Amino acid sequence: TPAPWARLWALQDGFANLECVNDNYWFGRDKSCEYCFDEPLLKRTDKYRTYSKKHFRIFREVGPKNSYIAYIEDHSGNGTFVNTELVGKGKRRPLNNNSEIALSLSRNKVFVFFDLTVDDQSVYPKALRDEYIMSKTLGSGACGEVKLAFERKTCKKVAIRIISKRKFAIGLNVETEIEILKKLNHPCIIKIKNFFDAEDYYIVLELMEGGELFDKVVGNKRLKEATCKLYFYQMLLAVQYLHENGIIHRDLKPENVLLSSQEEDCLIKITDFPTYLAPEVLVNRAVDCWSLGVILFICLSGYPPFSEVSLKDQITSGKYNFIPEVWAEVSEKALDLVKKLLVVDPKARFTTEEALRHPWLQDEDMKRKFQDLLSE
Amino acid sequence: TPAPWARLWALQDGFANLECVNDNYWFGRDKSCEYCFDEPLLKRTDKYRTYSKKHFRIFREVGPKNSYIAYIEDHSGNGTFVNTELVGKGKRRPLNNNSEIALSLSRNKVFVFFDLTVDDQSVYPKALRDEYIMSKTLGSGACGEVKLAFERKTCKKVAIRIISKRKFAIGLNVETEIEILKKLNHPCIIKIKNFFDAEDYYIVLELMEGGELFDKVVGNKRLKEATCKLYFYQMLLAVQYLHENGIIHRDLKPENVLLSSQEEDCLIKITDFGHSKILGPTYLAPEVLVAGYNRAVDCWSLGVILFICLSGYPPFSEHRTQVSLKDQITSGKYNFIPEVWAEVSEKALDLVKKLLVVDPKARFTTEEALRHPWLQDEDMKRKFQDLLSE
């Protein structure tokens, strides 16, 4: 009934392949061994007599996070070698995937071990795997694991984020909340494509092939002012839409402003509902507006307005780090808007509506560009 | 020169095992194929003629998180089957580890594919792997990945947490900060066993075999008052030590009170205190929901951890009638269920109350807690001392 957690592969003929289902396997000549060097083929060998009555064992054990770890334990006298190195008499070590087991001699390769407790797709609710193929981890979010997946038949990439129900289990909520987000229909917002419920919550989301605004801005590179304008415009529309649907972001940053292609001109899409923390929080819509200011500052300049006395002191006093050499090539209007957005007092800070009316954004050409991309 | 990213395993004799080094492999009868069904052994077969000139390909591709993803693409007419299911003519799909490749017939198993992009040792800085064997992921922290590891020779379990230097790369800091935490020497605090620096920061920490206080307290189970007392005593010593070394926790909760074995009586160890400083709510103090008093914050937290330990439920929760969680906390009216508390001592309840006081100036300090009657148990104190010998 149970699925195998490991395959052992015989390298020399006169050895059987093993598929590990039980928790423990002894290898040796002894009749009592779960895996016995007894096959009358192997018996005529002289190196056969180099192997011990009870040579070595492979086994599982519960991992500190309810996981499973495979170990090998050498009990031989002429040695059990793993990837060339001797384990040793009475000694014990973890068994990595694709390990080589040699016996009596380092050169004498016998088995290759494969851990199946990896990709191990049984780990997921069947309803989900019937629909998707779970792939690599894409990152560690504010929720938990976001993993790559593929639609079984179309073979389309999707992102699946995984949150643990154990996380709130001391003393359900998400099910109603998902449906509200699911109804949302706008081309600059991430679509919540699907939703599953097992021991964990799985939330299938559309995957953005272009990745994060962050990457276009890390390493002292900067974006053409017009590209900044395009992106920020879209960011304003996005945030406003959220605000109008009673959602406040609270954690807007380049790593969750997503781009839709490797083309410079393209659709921005927002996700996930301290350099970026508002000063008033360091002491609710204004919060997102401060964030955009920062995102804007970084886009135009290629460096952050506040970096590492304290980072907190700089923010609460609202004296952003202004480098003339970097800003000289940026427009007066662009600089102006940034300043309006980076205002300590939230009652003074520009609102998104005020930002959209700001002169810097009065570009009927880039507005048309945005409209074009919606056709794309 | 390059290491193989996959092994293919021949299931039928008259087929070679393949070790994938190149980015693309075509399988087929055709001479041009990187893997050719041509061996004069295989040629006499009748099912040999069921295979296509250009049957299928296996290949790599760069993944979104700088990853590599292995795909199979069927180009046959009689089919390429993967784990029983037909891929299909012109079709393409990802190749999971331990996949079975059949050809022409579902039953006709030929290859088993093994992905080697499965945790490899060489992804990490050599200095580290010379010392440790990297194992399974233990979780995703406030830092990044915490993984299981083993000391190369002793074979002792350790936890290694991995943080990315790319994370702050827009516009080093951690190196000086680590040394301060490294000097800390108290049995109820996690020891920072070692530290490495490559493209990523690796921080080797001691692994707690008992996991999180959280697990012993989730699902309506509760702990014997004496076990609460043992744990909480240790928690007080731990927090006091931190406070005396100028570190305020700010995020004390069951998920970061660690236990040292599956035995009920055992060492508690605390974590994420400067790990909640390396990067820069049931447990949030009411005053934070509204200088050297920032300590009260940790003291409120312990009251909560204490409440939960003795009762098996939280002092403040979310319910659709009692309005906000914030309202309950700021007004300090914890949810008291007589049926649950009847078996808990008066003194224990007393201390909880002293810790759960809205005004920080009134709240018990850790010194005040330790002098509280509930904790005047010379027997449990001796127990603690015993475990230090263990």
What are the backbone dihedrals phi and psi of residue A111, each rounded to the nearest 5 degrees, phi first? -130, 145
The CATH number of B1-120, from 3.40.190.10, 2.40.50.140, 2.60.200.20, 3.40.50.10490, is: 2.60.200.20
The CATH number of A208-376, from 1.10.540.10, 3.90.1310.10, 1.10.260.40, 1.10.510.10, is: 1.10.510.10
> Which residues lie closer than 8 Å to B307 by C-beta, 6 or more apart?
B314, B315, B334, B352, B356
* Amino acid (1-letter code) at residue A87: V
Residue A163: which of A119, A125, A197, A135 has the closest Cα? A197
CB contact (8 A) between residue A64 and residue B218 = no
CB contact (8 A) between residue B64 and residue A115 = no
> What's the alpha-carbon Rg for chain A, to the nearest Å?
29
* Amino acid (1-letter code) at residue B140: S
CATH class of B121-207: alpha beta
Is B272 an active-site residue?
Answer: no
Per the DSSP assignment, residues forming a β-bridge with B9 are B112
CB contact (8 A) between residue A298 and residue B170 = yes
Distances (CA, A) of B89 to B58, B79, B112: 15, 7, 21
Per the DSSP assignment, residues forming a β-bridge with B151 are B132
* Amino acid (1-letter code) at residue A115: D
What are the backbone dihedrals phi and psi of residue A97, each rounded to the nearest 5 degrees, phi first? -60, 145
Partners of A141 on chain B (C-beta within 8 Å) are 140
3-class secondary structure for chain B? CCCCCEEEEECCCCCCCEEECCCEEEEECCCCCCEECCCCCHHHCCHHHHCCCCCEEEECCEECCCEECCEEEECCCCCEEECCEECCCCCEEECCCCEEEEECCCCCEEEEEEECCCCCHHHCCHHHHCCEEEEEEEEECCCCEEEEEEECCCCCEEEEEEEEHHHHCCCCCHHHHHHHHHHCCCCCECCCCEEEECCEEEEEEECCCCCEHHHHCCCCCCCCHHHHHHHHHHHHHHHHHHHHCCCCCCCCCHHHEEECCCCCCCCEEECCCCCCCCCCCCCCCCCCCCCCCHHHHHHHHHHHHHHHHHHCCCCCCCCCCCCCHHHHHHCCCCCCCHHHHCCCCHHHHHHHHHHCCCCCCCCCCHHHHHHCHHHCCHHHHHHHHHHHHC
| Cβ burial B308-329 (10 Å sphere, 16+ → b, else e) | bbbbbbbbbeeeeeeeebeebb
Identity of the residue in A94, A137, A169 whose CB atom sits nearest the CB atom of B133:
A94
Domain B208-390 carries which CATH code? 1.10.510.10
Identity of the residue in B98, B280, B317 whose CB atom sits nearest the CB atom of A171:
B317
* Amino acid (1-letter code) at residue B178: I
Identity of the residue in B63, B148, B317 whose CB atom sits nearest the CB atom of A63:
B148
Per the DSSP assignment, residues forming a β-bridge with B28 are B36
What are the backbone dihedrals phi and psi of residue B233, each rounded to the nearest 5 degrees, phi first? -55, -55
> Which residues lie closer than 8 Å to A335 by C-beta, 6 or more apart?
A300, A327
What are the backbone dihedrals phi and psi of residue A49, each rounded to the nearest 5 degrees, phi first? -75, 0
d(CA A376, CA A266): 9
Calculate ∠ Cα B381-B384-B389, nearest 5°. 135
d(CA A202, CA A130): 14
What are the backbone dihedrals phi and psi of residue A149, each rounded to the nearest 5 degrees, phi first? -145, 165
Question: How many beta-carbon pairs under 8 angstroms link A with B?
Answer: 125
Residues, chain B, total? Answer: 390
Annotated active-site residue in A251, A265, A272, A363: A251
Residue B372 and residue B365 in contact, taking contact as beta carbons nearer than 8 Å: no
Return the biggest CA–CA distance within chain B.
91
Distances (CA, A) of A112 to A130, B10, B206: 31, 14, 31
- Which pair of structure tokens corresponds to residue A200? 């964990």
3-class secondary structure for chain A? CCCCCEEEEECCCCCCCEEECCCEEEEECCCCCCEECCCCCHHHCCHHHHCCCCCEEEECCECCCCCECCEEEECCCCCEEECCEECCCCCEEECCCCEEEEECCCCCEEEEEEECCCCCHHHCCHHHHCCEEEEEEEEECCCCEEEEEEECCCCCEEEEEEEEHHHHCCCCCHHHHHHHHHHCCCCCECCCCEEEECCEEEEEEECCCCCEHHHHCCCCCCCCHHHHHHHHHHHHHHHHHHHHCCCCCCCCCHHHEEECCCCCCCCEEECCCCCCCCCCCCCCHHHHHHHHHHHHHHHHHCCCCCCCCCHHHHHHCCCCCCCHHHHCCCCHHHHHHHHHHCCCCCCCCCCHHHHHHCHHHCCHHHHHHHHHHHHC
CB contact (8 A) between residue A307 and residue B218 = no
Partners of A307 on chain B (C-beta within 8 Å) are 171
Residue A51: which of A74, A34, A25 has the closest Cα? A74
> Which residues lie closer than 8 Å to A373 by C-beta, 6 or more apart?
A265, A266, A267
d(CA B161, CA B206): 11
d(CA A298, CA A341): 13
End-to-end CA distance of chain A: 51
- Where do the domains of chain A lie? 1-120, 121-207, 208-376
Calculate ∠ Cα B163-B166-B171, nearest 5°. 120
Elucidation technique: X-ray
Residue B189: which of B247, B265, B130 has the closest Cα? B247
- Which pair of structure tokens corresponds to residue A180? 């509200």
Residue A157: which of B62, B98, B23, B123 has the closest Cα? B62
* Amino acid (1-letter code) at residue B119: D
Between β-strands B200-206 and B157-164, what pairing exists: parallel, antiparallel or unpaired? Answer: antiparallel
- Which pair of structure tokens corresponds to residue A8? 């052992």
Interface probe, candidates B120, B140, B250, chain A, greatest A C-beta count within 10 A: B140
Residue B358 and residue B285 in contact, taking contact as beta carbons nearer than 8 Å: no
Distance from the Cα of residue B293 to its chain's centroid? 33
> What's the alpha-carbon Rg for chain B, to the nearest Å?
29
Q: How near does any CA of chain B get to the CA of A132, in Å?
A: 11
Residue B141 and residue B129 in contact, taking contact as beta carbons nearer than 8 Å: no
Sign of CA dihedral B28, B31, B36, B37: positive
Nearest CA in chain A to B209: A64
Distances (CA, A) of B311 to A160, B39, B55, B120: 36, 72, 65, 45
Q: Gap positions in chain B, given as the residue before each gap (C–N > 2.5 A)?
A: 171, 280, 290
> Which residues lie closer than 8 Å to B324 by C-beta, 6 or more apart?
none
Between β-strands B56-59 and B71-74, what pairing exists: parallel, antiparallel or unpaired? Answer: antiparallel
